[PDB]
């Protein structure tokens, strides 16, 4: 069996065992493995599910800590706040490193190899996603550039998705979901967010009406967010 075939099998084991840092490493090998061709749908998906879970943990930890820090600083208790933030820094450094590894992999290998609308929107979305994860905790000029980077990646992703993929396509549907969340949570623009979310959802329903558990779930998320934001 080929080496690439092994790493893939290994990554699927890492996933079952829920050791995502390792699942990332394996798919990271398969990535840097081939040069001419691009990752299969399964491989491309395993790579982001892996990163998604690695970043997702620190993101959850970050929210908990951040939430606690808030409650404590508004309690006046300062001795705690310094320890909460000292801990948050640590969580944030990891988020930075995680985001950095996948962003570099996106520019060096992932994006250059996208030979279709499917993978191009996919990788461009990831690009935006991780600059977004940065923007969630950054604040000063760092936030501004993470935001700018997010917007650029999502817009580039949207141009391709809007023309090359169906409104029912899950990648395109997910791009809309995230892009609209970006407007609502980082740009604090519920107007631009709702328009986008509503528009993508409507086009999906339209296409569906005239002429995938995959896309159905994403649409349910778009709706939950729409109703959610209408409060």
């Amino acid at each position: 069996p080929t080496a690439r075939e092994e790493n893939v099998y290994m990554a699927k084991l890492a996933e079952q065992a829920e050791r995502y840092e390792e699942m990332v490493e394996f798919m990271e090998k398969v990535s840097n493995s081939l040069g001419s061709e691009e990752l299969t749908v399964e491989e491309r998906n395993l790579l982001s599910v892996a990163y998604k879970n690695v970043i997702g943990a620190r993101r959850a930890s970050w929210r908990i800590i951040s939430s606690i820090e808030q409650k404590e600083e508004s309690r006046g208790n300062e001795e705690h706040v310094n320890s909460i933030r000292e801990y948050r820094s640590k969580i944030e450094n990891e988020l930075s490193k995680i985001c950095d590894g996948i962003l570099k992999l996106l520019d060096a290998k992932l994006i250059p190899s996208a030979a279709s609308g499917d993978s191009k929107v996919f990788y461009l979305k990831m690009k935006g996603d991780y600059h977004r994860y940065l923007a969630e905790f950054k604040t000063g000029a760092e936030r501004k550039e993470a935001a700018e980077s997010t917007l650029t990646a999502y817009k580039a992703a949207q141009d391709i998705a809007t023309t090359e993929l169906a409104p029912t396509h899950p990648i395109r549907l997910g791009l809309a979901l995230n892009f609209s969340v970006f407007y609502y949570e980082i740009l604090n623009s519920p107007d631009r967010a709702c328009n986008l979310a509503k528009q993508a959802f409507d086009e999906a329903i339209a296409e569906l009406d005239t002429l995938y558990k995959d896309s159905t779930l994403i649409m349910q998320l778009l709706r939950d967010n729409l109703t959610l934001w209408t409060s």
Partner: peptide
């Protein structure tokens, strides 16, 4: 926060 994928 909001739902993302």
């Amino acid at each position: 926060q909001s739902y993302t994928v």
